[PDB]
Amino acid sequence: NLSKFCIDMTAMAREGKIDPVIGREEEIRRVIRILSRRTKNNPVLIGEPGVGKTTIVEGLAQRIVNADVPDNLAACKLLSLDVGALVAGSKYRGEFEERMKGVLKEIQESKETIILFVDEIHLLMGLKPMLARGQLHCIGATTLAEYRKYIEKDAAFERRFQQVLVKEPSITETISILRGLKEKYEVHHGVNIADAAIVAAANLAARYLTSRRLPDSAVDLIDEAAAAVRVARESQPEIIDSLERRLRQLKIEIHALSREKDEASKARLAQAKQDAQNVEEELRPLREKYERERQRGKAIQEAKMKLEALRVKAEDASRMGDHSRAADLQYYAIPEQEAIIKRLEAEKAAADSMITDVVGPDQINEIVARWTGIPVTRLKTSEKEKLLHMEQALSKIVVGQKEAVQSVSNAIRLQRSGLSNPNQPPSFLFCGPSGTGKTLLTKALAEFLFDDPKSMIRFDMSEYQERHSLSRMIGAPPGYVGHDAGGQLTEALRRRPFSILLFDEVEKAAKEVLTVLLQLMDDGRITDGQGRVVDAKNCIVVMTSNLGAEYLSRAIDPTTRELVMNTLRNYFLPEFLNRISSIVIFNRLTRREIRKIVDLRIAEIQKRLTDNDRNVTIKVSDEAKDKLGAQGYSPVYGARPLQRLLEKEVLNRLAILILRGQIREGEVACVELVDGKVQVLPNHPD
């Protein structure tokens, strides 16, 4: 029998082997409704990895055994085909075909009405279960991209399925899932889980673990924290460790001192016995309280496990009409058990760091820090603290755009405090000359909000200038130009919801593409090429332009404000400009502002020198710093030429002199203005 490749999900439901399903009621109704059709009655779940496609099928198994299904599905055996163990457990040989025909024909013959679930069904499309006589009912699962690239390219097979879009849960929806799962993961690892950790896991998974989708990214995070405390609780506390070792040390010293015959040894041998006794007097109360209390936390955890097992037997008794055994458990066994837990737990808090058996926000922040590589100190700081000094944090990166930094900071504060439309993402149009900070501010925002430059995604509107390019942005219907690649924007929103979308040189976008941005800015959601609406409530929109550099001379001025804004009113329609949260204007950088930018860059070069072994300190004379700022600025490219200019004039020679030994450890690399050209001079002749 080819039960080697399938697991009975309906069986697992009767045995309490399926963790609870939270929410997702409308999706399970859709699956039931599709299955009950006679038309195309095979649902295919379409969603990103980890959004909960499988647990939807698991909920259906729970509904089949609980009679919460229509009659046509009540006596169904819902089987899950292990396609992973099928294609990987096989080679090019004819065993893939032979193995699947075997299972497909065991389904054929036996007389249970059987619904086959195949997760990652695209792996079966590179095979032919055309048993659509009404022999088998199938539930498929895959991602949207793989549905497009592998399932959508065999229409005849596809048309017998009906899409069910499974969107990613909100953070709020995610904690409801984690809260509902809380007790299962408590009893499983034998530890306790605080609610603030659950809120921490959901909020942090969405913000920093952008590589995996909710709620899986939050589930994996709590599960790893719990496993990290499963070993902490089975280890002696730190103070019992330290005490026990000094005690063993003093016992060594006592045996040794008792051998030496002299006046000073005997006076401290007696002191060593006392020090040993003092340690033992501090250690015995503690070591006793620890074991006393780890033995009870373990007695509680099995008390919880027999309770759960009783409820499985009780649910199955009442399901099978055995009222005799169902009365045993529901009225006597289970409340006798529940009374044992109530008493053992009540004394637990009453007994009363030590015995770490709790998943707290610290354990979540530490687990994430190891995975994400961000220092734990940066994850403990409250969002409210950062946002209150946001202008401070950005101004360390962006010079001379105080009016811009204030606008970005105020808009973000408006949304975490709940005063902005919750269906509209913050939207920005940066306007001003090249090399003034428009892109840089957006990078600083990315690293401030998500502590990662990757959190921003860049779209260059120079590549979306014609009406033909819209399919590149959102995708295309089947059989069209770029149906399979999808859209750049739509695919970015599905896989990186908490992102900053930078649209560079937005003035060049085709009017059809601008229309998509207005939908993004107004409704917080867009429609892809196939009518599907993808969500975007949790992104940030930054658009950059330079249509105002004509009226900005190096000097911010308020009369110049509407000459650039009237230049904007003809390129963009008034409804476009009205739906932008803040139209922000960058002015040209002054000579002093250009000079601090130079100090910023030497500070970074100074950091790499310090980050490596070298104790070389870069100091810049005033007039040399002045020539760098004069050679660096350009009325056309702003501060862009500055990074390369320093490299060419200062850094090239500074390298050579370091490796030549003409600037040694502990000395200063003095960069001067000699004969009107910036140079850095040696400190020792060759």
Ligand X SMILES: Nc1ncnc2c1ncn2[C@@H]1O[C@H](COP(=O)(O)OP(=O)(O)O)[C@@H](O)[C@H]1O
- The distance of closest approach from Cβ of residue 642 to a copy of itself in the complex, given in angstroms and rounded to an integer, is 14
Q: Residues 531 to 560: which contact ligand X by CB under 6 A?
A: 544
Considering only 257, 638, 651, 657, the residue that binds ligand X (CB under 6 A) is 638
Distance CA 594, CA 100 (A): 69
Considering only 35, 65, 69, 219, the residue that binds ligand X (CB under 6 A) is 219
- The distance of closest approach from Cβ of residue 633 to ligand X in the complex, given in angstroms and rounded to an integer, is 10
- The distance of closest approach from Cβ of residue 634 to ligand X in the complex, given in angstroms and rounded to an integer, is 11
- Of 120 and 463, the one with the shorter C-beta distance to a copy of itself is 463
CB under 5 to 8 A by kind: which of a copy of itself, ligand X, none does 355 bind? none
- Of 319 and 458, the one with the shorter C-beta distance to a copy of itself is 458
- The distance of closest approach from Cβ of residue 153 to a copy of itself in the complex, given in angstroms and rounded to an integer, is 28
Nearest residue to 182 (alpha-carbon basis) of 346, 355, 300, 20: 20
* Residues 6 or more apart whose Cβ sits within 8 Å of residue 418: none
Considering only 43, 425, 426, 435, the residue that binds ligand X (CB under 6 A) is 435
Distance CA 568, CA 544 (A): 12
Which helix H or strand E contains 618, and what residues bound it? strand 617-620
Q: Residues 141 to 200: which contact ligand X by CB under 6 A?
A: 177, 181
Distance CA 266, CA 291 (A): 37
Which helix H or strand E contains 271, and what residues bound it? helix 263-319
- The distance of closest approach from Cβ of residue 655 to a copy of itself in the complex, given in angstroms and rounded to an integer, is 4
- Of 53 and 122, the one with the shorter C-beta distance to ligand X is 53
Nearest residue to 122 (alpha-carbon basis) of 140, 136, 139: 140
Pattern 396-425, binding to ligand X, x per CB under 6 A? --xxxx------------------------
Please choose, out of 36-44, 53-61, 312-320, 444-452, the segment that lies near ligand X by the rule CB under 6 A: 53-61
Query: Dihedral, CA atoms, 276, 281, 287, 289, nearest 10 degrees?
Result: 180
Considering only 140, 190, 215, 425, the residue that binds ligand X (CB under 6 A) is 215
Q: Vertex 96, ends 95 and 99: CA angle to 5°? A: 75
Distance CA 549, CA 636 (A): 9
Residue whose entry in the numeric block shows the structure tokens 């004509």: 550
- The distance of closest approach from Cβ of residue 419 to ligand X in the complex, given in angstroms and rounded to an integer, is 16
Nearest residue to 534 (alpha-carbon basis) of 112, 203, 96, 46: 46
Distance CA 138, CA 123 (A): 15
- The distance of closest approach from Cβ of residue 470 to ligand X in the complex, given in angstroms and rounded to an integer, is 25
* Residue 127 C-alpha from the chain's centroid: 35
- The site for a copy of itself (CB under 8 A) is made up of 384, 387-388, 410, 413-414, 416-422, 454, 458, 460, 462-463, 467, 484-485, 504, 523, 570, 573-575, 605, 608-609, 611-614, 647, 651-652, 654-656, 658-661
- Of 95 and 667, the one with the shorter C-beta distance to a copy of itself is 667
CB under 5 to 8 A by kind: which of ligand X, a copy of itself, none does 94 bind? none
CB under 5 to 8 A by kind: which of a copy of itself, ligand X, none does 528 bind? none
Distance CA 458, CA 499 (A): 10
Task: Count how many residues are written for the chain.
Answer: 686
- Of 284 and 569, the one with the shorter C-beta distance to a copy of itself is 569
When asked if residue 597 is in the footprint of ligand X (CB under 6 A), the reply is yes
Structural tokens at position 652? 């090239």
CB under 5 to 8 A by kind: which of ligand X, a copy of itself, none does 420 bind? a copy of itself
Number of residues that bind ligand X (CB under 6 A): 37
324 by DSSP, 3-state: which?
helix
- Of 47 and 487, the one with the shorter C-beta distance to ligand X is 47
When asked if residue 61 is in the footprint of ligand X (CB under 6 A), the reply is no
CB under 5 to 8 A by kind: which of ligand X, a copy of itself, none does 388 bind? a copy of itself
Hey, what amino acid is at 651? L
Q: Decide if 118 contacts 83 (C-beta within 8 A).
A: yes
CB under 5 to 8 A by kind: which of a copy of itself, ligand X, none does 19 bind? ligand X
- Of 328 and 463, the one with the shorter C-beta distance to a copy of itself is 463
Query: Dihedral, CA atoms, 650, 651, 653, 654, nearest 10 degrees?
Result: 100
Q: Decide if 585 contacts 403 (C-beta within 8 A).
A: yes
Distance CA 231, CA 78 (A): 37
Distance CA 606, CA 301 (A): 56
Distance CA 578, CA 285 (A): 70
- The distance of closest approach from Cβ of residue 516 to a copy of itself in the complex, given in angstroms and rounded to an integer, is 14
Distance CA 81, CA 141 (A): 12
When asked if residue 10 is in the footprint of ligand X (CB under 6 A), the reply is no
Residue nearest to ligand X (CB): 52
* Binding-site ranges for ligand X (CB under 6 A): 19-24, 47, 49-55, 177, 181, 215-216, 219, 398-401, 434-440, 544, 589, 597, 638-640, 643
